[PDB]
Amino acid sequence: QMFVARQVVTNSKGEKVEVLWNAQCYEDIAQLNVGFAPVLESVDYHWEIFLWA
Amino acid sequence: LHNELNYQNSRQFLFRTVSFLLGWALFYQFYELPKTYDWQDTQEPKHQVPAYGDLEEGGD
Amino acid sequence: VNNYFYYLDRIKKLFTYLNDLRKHILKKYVYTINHKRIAINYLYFSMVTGLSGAALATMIRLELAHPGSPFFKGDSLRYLQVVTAHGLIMVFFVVVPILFGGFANFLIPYHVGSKDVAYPRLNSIGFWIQPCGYILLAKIGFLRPQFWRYYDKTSFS
Amino acid sequence: GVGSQDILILSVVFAGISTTISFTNLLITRRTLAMPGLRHRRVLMPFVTISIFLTLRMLATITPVLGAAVIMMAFDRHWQTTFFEYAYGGDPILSQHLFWFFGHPEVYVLIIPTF
Amino acid sequence: CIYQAYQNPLRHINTGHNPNNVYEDIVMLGDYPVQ
Amino acid sequence: RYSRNRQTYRTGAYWCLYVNIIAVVAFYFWFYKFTMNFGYLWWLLYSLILS
Amino acid sequence: MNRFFKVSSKYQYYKYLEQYDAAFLRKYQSETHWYLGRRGAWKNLVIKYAGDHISLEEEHNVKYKTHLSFVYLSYRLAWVLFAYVLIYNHFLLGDIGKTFNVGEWDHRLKPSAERDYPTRYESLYILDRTQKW
Amino acid sequence: RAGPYNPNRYKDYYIPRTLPKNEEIVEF
């Protein structure tokens, strides 16, 4: 639920960067899994979604 | 110059508006107000003494 | 240390825990301006008001179960009061609270993308002014100015 | 008689005030605190939020009419202003007009968020 | 704060904003700082 | 871009409690002519007095 | 450059004024800086610290907070009366006569109301008053 | 539990505490 895929690609400057395809939600931040673990469950519940405003 | 002109305009506004208000008050102090206008608007004889008395409540 | 009041220490910890929990509950759920907690409080208040409206509808359906007024027993005015209260608290104090209060306060900060709402104070105020109107509209079927029943001898008092 | 009916009228006034607070708060929340990309695009938001905002605009339009109607009813009940008495000028139909002008938009604002 | 001293009375005018049994005001009832 | 906002509204919670009390009590007194009998549940009255 | 000629005070601090031009002091101790010139703005720091902390939110006026007596009276009354409202309107409506009192007071023009008496003293006093116009 | 924290009571160093020389300004 952090990133659904990973892809290593070299750009036009030959830097060999990586791109992480995130896990997304359909128009609904309430349905978005805001987690920091490589798991599928929704374990974290945040009272303040925008913590730092 | 904008600040200084604001000050000058404040003086002008104060003097002119105070003069206007005092002249307004003095005019209405000396003016003989016409109190002889028609008073028909305040009188409604059908309502002051209800013409439908005893019939407003359903009775037939 | 052979202290004589170990049970007393346990009880002291219990009292401290109770006071801390009281302060925590008040600061977190009653005094808060967080839109999610306010929305959840709205949802629970709406559960209570929906149960009230369901009870009023139950009274309505029990009066209409069969002719002869089995529920109110010939009291038409009480039935009309029950019907009016049912309609008013179902429209204005069940569906409107649920939708607007609960879902709006929970989801507008998500969908619009805002930190709480524009007026968190007004949000809390709306939630905490709901109950008075709820009670006033929902309890008219129990209350009338002439509260005494037909066997209360008012000539005695 | 004086009692439950007055309770209902004044409770409807209070409900109008509460709805005023609610729609003001939420409409200004959208109009001011929207994220930089979702300021004006109705389509982007989830459909329940579009419905809620439309219904809040409708409530903003219709609440003063109901408030005026119930305030007039209270005055007629307790001051004998004869707003809805035909005998000396009033008309009972005006009350139905005002109430239903409030009322049909009320059912629409009740139904649209479920859509 | 019951039986536990969390707040610091040296940094409060009036200790007693919360029900407690472990706080005392530094400037008590009869104390008046004067020139 | 908005300054820090205090996260609690205690005066607001109590002002709303007072608004509810005003609405219910005033409406019952004006229209039903009812005043609650606080002595029926006397221990709530004592909790008010004890506090 | 009209330099500050002399400071006659015996405080050696105030000797800083003699170094600067009159226009320089006029710019930074008057006009724009009038509410700051030649003043130690400690009160600004104290008031800033007052504002930015999580203080008591019951403010009476700018200078003082609300007296704790009024605050606690308001809060206790609010909680107890709200509990009474909820409990009575949810649990004690079976007997209105038991759980409610009938009270009333009318205009002085009209004769004294039947319910216009002091409660809890119905067995002691009969309250009446003379009409006024 | 941790005590009260006011970050404004501690110094922060975002601006150098000395002023540049005139010659250094011109040369820069």
Add this chain to the structure above:
Amino acid sequence: GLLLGLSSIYYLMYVRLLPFNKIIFAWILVAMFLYWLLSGFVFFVKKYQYSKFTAAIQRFWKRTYIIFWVIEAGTFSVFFYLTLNASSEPVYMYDQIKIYKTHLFSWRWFLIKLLPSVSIILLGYYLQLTLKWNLFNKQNTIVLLITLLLLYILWLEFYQFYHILSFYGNINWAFDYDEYIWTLELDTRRTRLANNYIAICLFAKFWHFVFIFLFWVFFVLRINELGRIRYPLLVANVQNFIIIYIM
């Protein structure tokens, strides 16, 4: 102030002989209501002295002002619309006189009525313009003059409001020739509906003026405590004066 206020309160209680417990309960409730409103506003005034009043906050409070006055102008707009096309009986036989009931009030009397409101508007503008180069003690003259004029307008509006609410109870003297005694009779009143609609509009006007008067009293107390006048609250008060004049 306390002597005058307590004497006035005791006199107003004594003349009506109000039941002490019920009215003191009601007054405690109203006091908590008003005090918590004013305490929230005092909290906002105190907080924004330093490090809180950014551009976003200032714009928020401007929006809040305009939103409040738009909300208060909705119900008044509905009442004014109903007042314009007020209901009446048919002109043919029921109400043949409404053709001549134009209800036109003299403009000269209205113009002499208008003087204090325009006076406070102009004084408020002068106060806000000269705040650039004037101190607090030098402007206390203008502030006190506006306060006294607002007290005068408050008394006039309350007098008219009291008369209007006194219309609806018809109290008359009836002679009983059998007993040779006069008696005081209370009755209802019948009148043209336009009068009732304009009465409701004038009630709304009085309550809005009471709100702006409390606004001004709050502002003057705050500026006296702080020791200086600031632009936002002052200009809000001036716009309040203009709006109440329009009403």
Add this chain to the structure above:
Amino acid sequence: FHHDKGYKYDVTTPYDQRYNYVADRLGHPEILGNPFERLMRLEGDIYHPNYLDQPFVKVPNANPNASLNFEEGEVLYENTRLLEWAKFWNYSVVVGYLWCAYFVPYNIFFKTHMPLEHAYDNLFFPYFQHTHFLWDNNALHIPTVGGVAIYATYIALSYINNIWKDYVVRAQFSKDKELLFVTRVSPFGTTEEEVYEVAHLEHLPPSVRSGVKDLSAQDADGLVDVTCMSSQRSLVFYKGDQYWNPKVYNDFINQTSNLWTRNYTGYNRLEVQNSVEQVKIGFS
């Protein structure tokens, strides 16, 4: 350091290393509070121990500096009649206030039932009388009248005092002429004494340079406004020689007139080159 909110660069400046207050020598007893507001258990932001615990500087001492000497000296300025005028005006206003706020409303509200013309001239009701008893059953007018009376009287008295607070009834030097004891008008017309430092007193020119013509000090009998800059207060003196002491007047004028200089008018063709001092760079 605060392991949940703080950083390792969190070292409190000890109270010994904080900067002492040297801006002025007079004490600031506001940080103490008052015996009245300590007795009343009032909490103020100015005597809160947490807010007075400044981390980088020190708040001023409540007592005046020990170097200061408060022994009386030469009298500088004396216009005592102001007090009488004060009394007069204050009392007049109060009397007028009473007559215009309580007597007339009371007599036309309670002592009659007949309305005055301004009660109903714009209305189209038929004529009717009013009674104090058939209205406002739940008395919401009593708290309103009480509050209006209390706060209107408070505002009137407070702003009347504020208007008179600029004027100087008396001004007397200290023995060393380092302090100026200024007697001013109290709220009820009598004396109240304040103290200023002569070093902080300045006769500041107007911010608006075109307003120098429109000053009271232009007249031979006008007013001279001297600003105390350490407190931003005003001392208004009558510029008539009969109110001043010639033995100290010239010294006071010389000490207070330092920022009203020739640069206020501007720099001519010759003084513009000397408007500043050249900054020499690279001369080593």
Add this chain to the structure above:
Amino acid sequence: RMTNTTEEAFDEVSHEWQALVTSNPFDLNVFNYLENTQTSNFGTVDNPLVVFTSETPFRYVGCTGQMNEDDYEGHELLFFLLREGSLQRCMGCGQVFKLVRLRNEYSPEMDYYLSNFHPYEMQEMGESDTTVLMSPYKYASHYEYTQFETPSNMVYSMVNPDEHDRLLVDPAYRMERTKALEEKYKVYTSSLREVEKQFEERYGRAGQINISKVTYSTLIDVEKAVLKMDRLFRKVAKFENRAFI
């Protein structure tokens, strides 16, 4: 109407004025208007769409794909949590996002993102002498007018909190530091003038100015009239202030 930031602006007002006068990407990103954030390119691996955060580890980002003229959005609004550390892309449309965590510094790296921010509007800065316009046609879009002028002779210098406290409570130190900074401003302006003189000497003028002879003559006449009126005002001020100078 512009705040005297020496004595009044402390934390958020001070940060807002820093964002206004420095346009630093950190400060400017904190106080960027919620109404409009500057439109950017389409994210690619070579040219990723940069989303800024002011020292926060992540930010919610919604993607609507390649926006077109016919329909303002490409695909449905898909939200995700753009995190710090690497490039991340929307699998629906392939748009690559990079989270740039701006720091509170003056490095050349921060100045690289100086062109990705709208300049901070100064209309709402300071104090307003008009509450709100009552006109419905021009409301919520126009800002309130002002009766006063906005001065343009303010030079802002950043100070540490300790130094700012000392400046507030020590007037002598305040005057000393202010005069030192005025000398520094004179030196900096002279250095810029000398640099411009050298550049003009090396490369010549950009070009000639298209002017009318009427406008040329009127400019010279206006300059002479301004000097004459300044002399008259100087004489008038000297006569008015005679009793005080």
